[PDB]
Amino acid sequence: TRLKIVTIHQEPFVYVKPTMSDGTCKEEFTVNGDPVKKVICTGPNDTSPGSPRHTVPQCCYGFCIDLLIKLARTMNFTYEVHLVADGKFGTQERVNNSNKKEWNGMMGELLSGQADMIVAPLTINNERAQYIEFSKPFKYQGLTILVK
Amino acid sequence: NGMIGEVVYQRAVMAVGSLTINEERSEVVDFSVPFVETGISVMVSASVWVMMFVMLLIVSAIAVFVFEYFSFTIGKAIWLLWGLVFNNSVPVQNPKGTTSKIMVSVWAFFAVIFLASYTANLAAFMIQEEFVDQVTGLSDKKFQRPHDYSPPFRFGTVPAGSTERNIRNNYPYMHQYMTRFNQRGVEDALVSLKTGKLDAFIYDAAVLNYKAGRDEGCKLVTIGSGYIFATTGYGIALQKGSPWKRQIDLALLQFVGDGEMEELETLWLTGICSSQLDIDNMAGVFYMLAAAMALSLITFIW
Amino acid sequence: GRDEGCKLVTIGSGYIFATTGYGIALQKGSPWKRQIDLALLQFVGDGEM
Amino acid sequence: IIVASYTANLAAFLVLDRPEERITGINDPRLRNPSDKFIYATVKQSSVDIYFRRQVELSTMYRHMEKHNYESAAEAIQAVRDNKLHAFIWDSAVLEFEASQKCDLVTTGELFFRSGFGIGMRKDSPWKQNVSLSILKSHENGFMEDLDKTWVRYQETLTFENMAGVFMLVAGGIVAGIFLIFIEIAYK
Amino acid sequence: KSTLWLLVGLSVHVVAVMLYLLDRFSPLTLSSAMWFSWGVLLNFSARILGMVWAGFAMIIVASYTANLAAFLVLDRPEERITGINDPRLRNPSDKFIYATVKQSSVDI
Ligand SMILES: *[C@@H]1O[C@H](CO)[C@@H](O)[C@H](O)[C@H]1NC(C)=O
Ligand SMILES: *[C@@H]1O[C@H](CO)[C@@H](O)[C@H](O)[C@H]1NC(C)=O
Ligand SMILES: *[C@@H]1O[C@H](CO)[C@@H](O)[C@H](O)[C@H]1NC(C)=O
Ligand SMILES: *[C@@H]1O[C@H](CO)[C@@H](O)[C@H](O)[C@H]1NC(C)=O
Structure with a gap:
């Protein structure tokens, strides 16, 4: 009943904010009469050459955090949200020797046993579904271009 | 009944025929992964005037200064100034001063490119292609009460479908306004809209987008892409515990x-679809001259 | 059909020219010609x- | 005839040679065989990378994007924002959010690879059935619509193009026109 | 391979009477004001009504120039087929009567 959740800082979905003084979130309201249900999340600062080890308690909120709060409200379980140790979703890359494939990113921390449920903007394709099971989608999109 | 009675009761393997997916269907079978985005929908049918006025004040002050230099251009320079913006061929005043003539040669030459820019604005108005819409979605004030507007309009769906069960599990009092006003066929909704007997028609959005590709004259346009709506996906049904699901999803x-x-x-989704109508501008055209004749009652008594 | 700028245009379709085609060359007497052409x-x- | 031709071709000055680029999607042949000026990329080691690696007719753009792929979305937003990049292929939801946030960023036409957002699980985890039913439980009522109200649905001619210098000349030459009259003072 | 002109003709004759009415109100006029009202739209409060009608004069011919420039330029109609992808050929009617030579190459 304590399922480990991993995610990544997505700009419309998972807002990551530094805490105010020491592990405290600025509990702001919405524009409708509801406080933003932030959650205490852990994760690194930045890239490995830039940040070798900088993990502070942080405030994660947004869309998928509210989805996880809805799931923990419906199904009877607690959780402990951390983040991934890089900035990658996860691909199928050969390691240096032994002729062996590897999955990094969120599937990397999943298949290593460090996570149990990935709540993230997870794009459904054939390659990930061969190795992990998916649920039914909750938001449908495509692909497009951003211009100026 | 139909396909699900053949699937659940061990008489059919899978439902390759197209089927919506909602929650209570999924409790007894195992649906595959969806492949097409199928919601539900409804098939229905500033500074120019200020700074040109400031320049008008400047040019009128200089026109007064012409007579201050050296002849009835005392206060009636406005009646020539804004009149020669339009080149109306109206006898107003013959400028006897060289300064006034050079100032008119500046002003009217600016007015020529100004009206040419107004023709460019009208060409951009030709570029501006509009398609007016009425209803935002399912939670509209039209749908929640037919007496909210003076005609109580009629909306209908297809019977015994997933849309009706979504209504009966989401909006019970909405269902009784449609229960008297049902319809049967797919093309019966097209008949009811082209005859105008029925106002609205709530159905799955993708099939209506297909039917929009063959509308006679393309006069029936839906609402958005299911923004305030169900937003599910069509998927192939199976039986529970069937090992085919892992192959079918991949x-x-x-x-x-x-x-x-x-x-x-x-291929199987048809992706298709010079007069005067300016009543929003004609309203301002009549109302500015209404204000101009309303100022006449002020100018009468004084 | 892929040049940027499109500053180089031919003259129609080459109307005063040979107007031939690209085929598959085979040896004189090989039996593969009848099967390839169909x-x-x-x-x-x-x-x- | 001169003012008619001038009024015609000043309107035609902004009709013929417009910036009507309008790439709108994947089917631009300038991006099929790309130059080093139309710069476009995505996140390195993402789902877009595998999606363009599988398709054998989209590998060439891959051989462009292997020189340009980035790590975070916001750095790519800032790079295309100051025109360091020139295009950005990405997921439609994030782009339609951030174009609404900042109006300098613009989304465009095509919506290809219609897929959905999943939740990573194990093979036979006991939290598979009721969670997959609870997502559609959120679909059938308006709670997904309420979450769209929180974030997704939640929002946030000028006739001065070629006559600005003419406006400056009108605002400036009045002093010279009165100086002509000061010369006419010396004429008298 | 015009409609709203009657409203303009009614409005100009409303103006051609109310100019003389304001000339009576404000402290041959019938030959002056009528010829003025015919002359403005075709190229002190009475002068105010004259300059307002003169301001609304040129917008009429400007919009007429606009919709003639939009009327004989844009709508070159789809009297052609647009090839094989014609919706009147995928599911045809008597609108586009299309066929070929009987017992020919197109039939094969
Ligand atoms: C986080 O980022 C930088 C770069 O990785 C790192 O040097 C430092 O530890 C942190 N600084 C900030 C801005 O908090
Ligand atoms: C939920 O979880 C708590 C803590 O494990 C347990 O004691 C309780 O029986 C459960 N109650 C409900 C509402 O299912
Ligand atoms: C192999 O190992 C080196 C040292 O860690 C590293 O720089 C290199 O990227 C590795 N190559 C891969 C990813 O197989
Ligand atoms: C799912 O919900 C049902 C409700 O009765 C329960 O019996 C079952 O154990 C649940 N399974 C899990 C662990 O998700």
Whole structure:
């Protein structure tokens, strides 16, 4: 009943904010009469050459955090949200020797046993579904271009 | 009844025929991964005037200064100034001063490119292609009460479908306004809209977008893409515990991730669809002259 | 059909020229010609070309 | 005839040679065989990378994007924002959010690879059935619509193009026109 | 391979009477004001009504120039077929009567 959740800082979905003084979130309201249900999340600062080890308690909120709060409200379980140790979703890359494939990113921390449920903007394709099971989608999109 | 009674009761293997997916269907079977985005929908049918006035004040002050230099251009320079913006061929005043003539040669030459820029604005108005819409979605004030507007309009769906069960599990009092006003066929909704007997028609959005590709004259346009709506996906039903699901899901995601679904979306989905109408501008045209004749009652008594 | 700028345009379709085609060269006497030509006309006829 | 031709071709000055680029999607042949000026990329080691690696007719753009792929979305937003990049292929939801946030960023036409957002699980985890039913439980009522109200649905001619210097000349030459009259003072 | 002109003709004759009415109100006029009202739209409060009608004069011919420039330029109609992808050929009617030579190459 304590399922480990991993995610990544997505700009419309998972807002990551530094805490105010020491592990405290600025509990702001919405524009409708509801406080933003932030959650205490852990994760690194930045890239490995830039940040070798900088993990502070942080405030994660947004869309998928509210989805996880809805799931923990419906199904009877607690959780402990951390983040991934890089900035990658996860691909199928050969390691240096032994002729062996590897999955990094969120599937990397999943298949290593460090996570149990990935709540993230997870794009459904054939390659990930061969190795992990998916649920039914909750938001449908495509692909497009951003211009100026 | 129908397909699900053949699937659940051990008489059919899978439902390759197209089927919506909601929650209580999924409790007894195992649906595959969806492949097409199927919601539900409803098939229905500033500074120029200020700074030109400031320049008008400047040019009128200089026109007064012409007579201050050296002849009835005392206060009636406005009646020539804004009149020669339009080149109305009206006898107003013959400028006897060289300064006034050079100032008119500046002003009217600016007015020529100003009216040419107004023709460019009208060409951009020709570029501006509009398509007016009425209803935002399912939670409109039209739908919640027919007496909210003076005609109580009529909306209908297809019987015994998933849309009716979504209504009966989401909006019970909405259902009784449609229960008297049902309809049966797919093309019966087209008949009811082209005859105007029925106002609205709530149905799945993708099939209505297909029917929009063959509308006679393309006069029926839906509302958005299901923004305030169900937003599910069509998927192949199976039985519970069937090992075919792991193969079918990977085969569908193989079909999507290489453009093989894209050719089928191109083929079996028809992706199709000089007068005067300026009543928003004609209202201002009549009302500015209404204000101009309303100022006449002020100018009468004084 | 892929040049940027499009500053180089030909003259119509080459109207005063040879107007030939690209084929498959075979040796004089090989039996593959009759089998290849029917398959090429089949490739034209089904719109796959 | 001169003012008619001038009024015609000043309107035609902004009709013929417009910036009507309008790439709108994947089917631009300038991006099929790309130059080193139309710069476009995505996140390195993402789902877009595998989606363009599988398709054998989209590998060439891959051989462009292997020189340009980035790590975070916001750095790519800032790079295309100051025109260091020139295009950005990405997921439609994030782009339609951030174009609404900042109006300098613009989304465009095509919506290809229609897929959905999943939740990573194990093979036979006991939290598979009721969670997959609870997502559609959120679909059937308006709670997904309420979450769209929180974030997704939640929002946030000028006739001065070629006559600005003419406006400056009108605002400036009045002093010279009165100086002509000061010369006419010396004429008298 | 005009409609709203009657409203303009009614409005100009409303103006051609109310100019003389304001000339009576404000402290041959019938030959002056009528010829003025015919002359403005075709190229002190009475002068105010004259300059307002003169301001609304040129917008009429400007919009007429606009919709003639939009009327004989844009709508070159789809009297052609647009090839094989014609919706009147995928599911045809008597609108586009299309066929070929009987027993020919197109039939094969
Ligand atoms: C986080 O980022 C930088 C770069 O990785 C790192 O040097 C430092 O530890 C942190 N600084 C900030 C801005 O908090
Ligand atoms: C939920 O979880 C708590 C803590 O494990 C347990 O004691 C309780 O029986 C459960 N109650 C409900 C509402 O299912
Ligand atoms: C192999 O190992 C080196 C040292 O860690 C590293 O720089 C290199 O990227 C590795 N190559 C891969 C990813 O197989
Ligand atoms: C799912 O919900 C049902 C409700 O009765 C329960 O019996 C079952 O154990 C649940 N399974 C899990 C662990 O999700």
